[PDB]
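Summary for the steering committee. The consortium agreed at its last meeting that each partner would contribute one worked example illustrating the joint modelling workflow. Our contribution is presented below. We chose a case with several input lines so that the handling of multiple components could be demonstrated. No manual editing was applied between input and output; the record is shown as generated.
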Amino acid sequence: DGLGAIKHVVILMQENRSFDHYFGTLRGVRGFGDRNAVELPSGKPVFEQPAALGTSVLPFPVRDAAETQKKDLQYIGALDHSWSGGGKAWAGGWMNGWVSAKTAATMAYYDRRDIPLHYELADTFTVCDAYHSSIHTSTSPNRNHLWSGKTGNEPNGKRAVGNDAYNEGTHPGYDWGTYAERLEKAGRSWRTYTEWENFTDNQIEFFATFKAVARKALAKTGGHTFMESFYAAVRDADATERERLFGLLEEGVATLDKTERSLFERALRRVETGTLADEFAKDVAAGTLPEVSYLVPSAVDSEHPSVSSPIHSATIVYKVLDALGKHPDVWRHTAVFINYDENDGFFDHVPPPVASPEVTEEQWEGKPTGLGMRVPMLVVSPWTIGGYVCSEVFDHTSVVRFLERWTGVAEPNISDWRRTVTGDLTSAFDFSHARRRPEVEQPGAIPPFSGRWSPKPPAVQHMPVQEPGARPARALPYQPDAQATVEDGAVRVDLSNTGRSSAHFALYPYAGEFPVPQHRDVKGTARWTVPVTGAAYRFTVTGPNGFRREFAGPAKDGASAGAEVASRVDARERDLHLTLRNTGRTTLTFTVRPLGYVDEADLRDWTRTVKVKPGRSRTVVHSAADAHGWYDLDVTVDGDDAFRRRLMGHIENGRASVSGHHHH
Amino acid sequence: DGLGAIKHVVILMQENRSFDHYFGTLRGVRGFGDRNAVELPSGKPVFEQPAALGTSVLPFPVRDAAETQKKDLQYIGALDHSWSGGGKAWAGGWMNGWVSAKTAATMAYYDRRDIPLHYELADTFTVCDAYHSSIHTSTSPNRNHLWSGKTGNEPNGKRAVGNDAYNEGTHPGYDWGTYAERLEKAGRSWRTYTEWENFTDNQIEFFATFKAVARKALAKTGGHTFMESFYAAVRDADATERERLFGLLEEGVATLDKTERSLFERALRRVETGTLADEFAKDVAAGTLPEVSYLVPSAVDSEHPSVSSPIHSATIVYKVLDALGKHPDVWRHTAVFINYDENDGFFDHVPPPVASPEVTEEQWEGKPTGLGMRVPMLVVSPWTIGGYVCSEVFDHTSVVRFLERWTGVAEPNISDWRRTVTGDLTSAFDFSHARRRPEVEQPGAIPPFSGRWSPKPPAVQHMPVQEPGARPARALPYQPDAQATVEDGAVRVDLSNTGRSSAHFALYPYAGEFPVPQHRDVKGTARWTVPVTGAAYRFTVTGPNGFRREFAGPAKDGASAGAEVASRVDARERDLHLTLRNTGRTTLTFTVRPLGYVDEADLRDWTRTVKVKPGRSRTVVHSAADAHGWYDLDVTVDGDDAFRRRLMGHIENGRASVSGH
Ligand SMILES: [Ca+2]
Ligand SMILES: [Ca+2]
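What follows is the complete predicted structure of the assembly.
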């Protein structure tokens, strides 16, 4: 598994940016050109968000709005990022409440001219475009997953879905335990790198073991009971009062027992402001970088839109990666994960994989606590060079799962559902070939601050154009399929997935089959019974990595109900075997037409018309090998516009491939 | 001119090794024993590189570090090789930021016990010890120079001093010409020999013309737009997938017109992994070797320290030269240039000739873009046999200039400064006397890979010893001299060079005269004005091939104010005429003492003590003819501790000579 090449993992979680907000226009990721986008109940594509008075907001660039409103694109402000606001944007799974819940600024986005370091990093290393924040809400519950594998309950017994822990004087801290405490018990080295100001982002500080450590360490300081209280005083003190404060701290630190002292040194001692990267660089140069490093930048360095900016973040990212590259022998054995805690209130078009209501562990007030919106995740390391995309579903607990595989130290906090639906991040890596280490360009000057502002859409709206082209793609642990069978009052949808990992299916009803979209996780086989209440059915099933099955047609013994399409994927050949069946009394004529991945001067050789008589079946084999596994097929019956079957997907063979963007 | 005997030029450029890193111990080249080594501001020699807090790091052998750290000497890793890291190491021209910029591993070197084939080729053919990489940075800007004569600008208008072009799915490619496109239009034949994996070293692929041909030829491959994208899928594919992939490729290749098709075949079609020398040998055997061959090995064969090794490189170099030797008809009309793209971050002690700030075409962000660190260059041919050293200043564009002089196809991309300061590599050859193909030892077995590692300097440091002896040396197109006259508040330095090529002079200040070293290119005469603000001055001027002039003395009113030295070189006698004059009011006794090139038993007969009364002058004639034109003289005045004039160099006479050891 080649994980023995890793000696250091460095985790750098920035704040409050959604995937499309930054990378919707990036070549070769699931972005503004996504051909697996879901259609809203209004029939419009998810990108066309309902606004007030029957209007719509499309994604629009921050740069133009900044010019229009005469403001700086670096300093847009924050939007609602609350548990309730998220449920409103999410709208029961229909993903059409974004403008109402978040304002129209939710659709604003940056592109490569705006954030060139961000784009160059994705082009050089590996970017994850199915990486979700852990829960659709604010910072603290998301950071809980990264540090401990879950967000549990508040002391009042309610689910921890807000920032209540930030009242550090009155909150007693969370009691379900952190991963770093297990690393400590197992003898593995770790350290938090964090400055005097750290924007309540060092989540370990809110856990009960560490509150007890801080209180004892601070006992002599005149009343401070948690570190942020003490460091607020340090930040405001003159030189003389700082020396006094730090001398009183060190007297308290000397009273800690061996375990408390170690936890204090690794989680709670902050470095002077401005020196996070220099402190990290010093450990790199000394050969003392630990096995696991948490980098927790200050507010202004955090990328959070209320206190920071993209260029502030790019600046600290550069200094961290530069500090690493200054010592090649540490660089050759270090993986760096760069992600975001949540999406703020910024729109993203991918409906997240959610826990269905039967998964009570991951429901709160009738809403899923499981996988929020996509955020950018970049994996920077000697083993991820190449500009690859990795489309395996991950969340913040996937970082903990990486550490489980690497160190052997388990995190029992991760829920069974979450562990089933997310991966362990090992698929982003390729341990087999060395390359030269890329040089990363240093960011430009930080513009002078000229106030926060909120972008408003242009008067003339335009769909953004994603940078054209495909991207090399990592192999995925999925092999999904779905077939329909119309059966007396309902359609029986047979879901299958022969991959080594469970795959998430979502069903979107467009003929009143259900009131909201249905979600299911499948390893092996599973069955949806979709009740057809009228004369027709029309719904769409999505899955990972562009997988799509569309279903339309007539109901009981009513019209052309004889038509049956079955399918089987063959991984070794990357062939789709379509069994076309006639369950009726008339001699149907099927047509199979490519909708994509076939050069237009060529479709007729790949379009197939086949005649099937009553009680019989013909098999047509579609080869996707020329398209490296990608297929997009339309199956219809002549003289009938009710019946349709669309089949889109990528057949996996265990080897790297390309993304789906060479559709046209 | 003898260039008529050449029918084939073969260019094999390996990766990321500095000259001293490989040949600092080689007999008879400018290496670790270099008597013209520059002194650092600390007063230490350049080999003693400052580390932390008044400590330093001498060159140290990889082989010993490998015993200490229990690693394999073949598999040391790469160091920093960026434009800004190079600037820090070069340190404005003072050459004392190496350890800070690159880590102490920058001083690690190999010798004959470790890399015997490299040394044997130097002993057998011709080695160039003033061959520099074109620019002090990474691979791509240097390979730009070999393939195109320059590194121009990125699309954003910044100077292309980095590897931006390797982001091939986004970067649009470079817009100035390649030299190969000029050979093409001129009807000359050329071919690049490269495998499915070529480590982003086939520089022609990053020029817009070839990005366009690649995109067109890949149009039916289902998503690929640059060749490396397609071949990555080929390398991962089984035999059945491979046949489909090559079928998809050939469908697009069939759509190329006559000219695009020739470009594709000559620059873009890669051969199977492991068969580079085989496909080269096939062309040699069939009589179809082109006029110009670019050999671009795979990553594992490139010698690059992050993917390869010296023995991996020695293995492929030997196979290439063996293919040529197997066909004497082809060998006898073939010149092979073996060089390196850059020095990685490995130390080399020779400060490069750099463009001065006046030469704004070779400046970017206040740093010179012009001549990086020395790298090994070996010239293997019927006309370079005999173990010669050539010390004429060259860079990667000097290979292009050789092609100019041979094909008549000019490369206008080469800047005027580069044409002035570097030669055309004909000086490395002796076309009058072809000699028989010598045999060279085949490299041994490649050790199993045991991991990259970083050599650390030993606890007890030792300056390395260069192999003893001198080598035959090519005649050089320089004849430099420099002399000084003390004036009120300044020392005036008259530079001269009577050779047919411009000679590069550098001035190193050790008394505050300037904040950094100064650099001048001189054909004819030129003059420096060295400000003297204090009681004394001390500075050194270097020039090509061991040329040195040290000047030190009091500013005014000391025991030697009127001490003045002039010099005149005569090439026909290889004589140095020293004129010693007294422009003061006290009588002076000069001593002229050889510091080298005189038999220790004979030192006294060649030491001159001469009295020079005020307002008069006397002439000493130093005969360098028995030292093959080499001289190293110390001129002092009895009773003055400050005053010194050192004169060292080699008098050229148009004939092959010997090196300075
Ligand atoms: Ca946040
Ligand atoms: Ca290189």
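The first strand of chain B starts at residue 8 and ends at 14. Residues 310-325 of chain B form the longest helix (16 residues).
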